[PDB]
Every structure is written in structure tokens, then in C-alpha cells.
A paper describes a structure:
Across all domains of life, a widespread class of OB folds have specialized to recognize and manipulate tRNAs, perform key functions in tRNA trafficking and metabolism, and are designated as the tRNA binding domain (TRBD) superfamily (IPR002547; PF01588). In bacteria, Aquifex aeolicus Trbp111 (tRNA-binding protein, 111 amino acids) and Escherichia coli Trbp exemplify the free-standing, dimeric OB-fold proteins that bind diverse tRNA species. Trbp has been suggested to facilitate the folding of the tRNA structure by binding its characteristic elbow region formed by the intercalation of the D-loop into the T-loop and was observed to enhance aminoacylation by several aminoacyl-tRNA synthetases (aaRSs). Contrary to previous proposals, Trbp111 does not recognize the global tRNA structure nor its elbow or anticodon but solely binds its universal 3′ terminal single-stranded CA dinucleotide with a strong positional, structural, and sequence preference.
Author numbering:
A (entry chain B), B (entry chain A): -1 to 111
Write the structure that this text describes.
Amino acid sequence: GPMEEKALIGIEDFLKVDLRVAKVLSAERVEGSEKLLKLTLSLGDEERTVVAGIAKYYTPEELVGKKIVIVANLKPRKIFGIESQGMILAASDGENLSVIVPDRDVKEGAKLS
Amino acid sequence: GPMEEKALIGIEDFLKVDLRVAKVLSAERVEGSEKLLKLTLSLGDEERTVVAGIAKYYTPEELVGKKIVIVANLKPRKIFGIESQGMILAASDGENLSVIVPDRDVKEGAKLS
């Protein structure tokens, strides 16, 4: 369940996920939508387009040029006529929303798993 | 395998892992080990003890008081006599290691999944 408490998992279930560091090359508004943002991200040797519902929480000024953590091995989908592959990590406390960045300026493409 | 290319996954496999923001309360060294630090982490309403092999890259001083992303629902294990339950997110690029923090200040225990 999306709102349920998550039972204990082994390291395998974590290793199934491909967490990576990606540099936001650009973040533009999605036409016909006030909540979506189309973000191009560099993973070092490959680029990725991700549609994220964070337009009300993040302006593109506070995103472009930053290194953020993403899930790279999500199956591709069609969001508002845009081919989006993967998704961004985002933490909420019920009040604010925040993207997820590395503590030190690690290079783009750095893996977490 | 850890060095293998990870196949594409559905979002359920991601939702199965419990990624949370936790505040580092303390960070001490582990007796008999030169690589491991024992960190206590506040999740707002509950605490966690995690042993991490990052002493080569992080001193206690550059960790305590920070908000870092962790996997909170990992099965517990006895590491060097310490009961550790949970794992800290860490990004590496073959040259530098970095813990993972929220871009914006979010309340401890903030849910990412």
C-alpha cells in the first residue's frame, strides 16, 4: 500500500533499484499542466527525460545545474505526450517537498546501489 | 550481481523499500575496526542504530547534526557486536564517497517512498 507501513526487506529488494546521481541540464514547464515539470538529466554517458509533479514546489531556477538522486531503472511511460523514463527522489514531511542531492560534489552517474 | 546492469523494475519494487530522512544524533568509532562508524539516527518519532563503512571518507564531525537519507526497513544484523538495523544511502564514482541529504530542510522522518 502507498500509505501503508513497509515491512522489513532484504538487501536484494534494495539492489533491484538503480539509484543514481544525475545533473539537471534543464527543467521546463509542461504544456497544458500546472503541476508538471519536464527535466532533462545527464547521467554522465547518457541523458534521461523525467516528468515530475513538483512544479508548485520547485522553480526551474532552483533545479537547473544541481545534482539530484533518481531511480534510473523505472519502466518508461507516456506522461502528457512526453516519454519519461525514471523518476526523481523526493522527500516530504507533509508540509514541504525536497529533491535529494549528494552531500559532496560527486560526479554525474555515481551509483548508489 | 552487484557489478551487473540492473534490469528495469516496476514502481512496486521501489515502494517496497522505505527511504527516509534521518538526523544524525551521534557518530562514534567501532572498536577493532578502522573502517566502521556506529551512527544513531532520529526519524522524528523513533531512532535507529546503523553501522557504516565510511570512516575512511567521513569523520564524526562532518556527520553529526546532518539530515541524511537512509533505508529504514532493512533487516537487522549484528555487525561487530552492534545491532544495526537500517542502511545509509551512499553515492560513489570510483573516486569519492558521499552521503545523501535533502536539498531543502525537511523534518526528520520525512518519507521518500
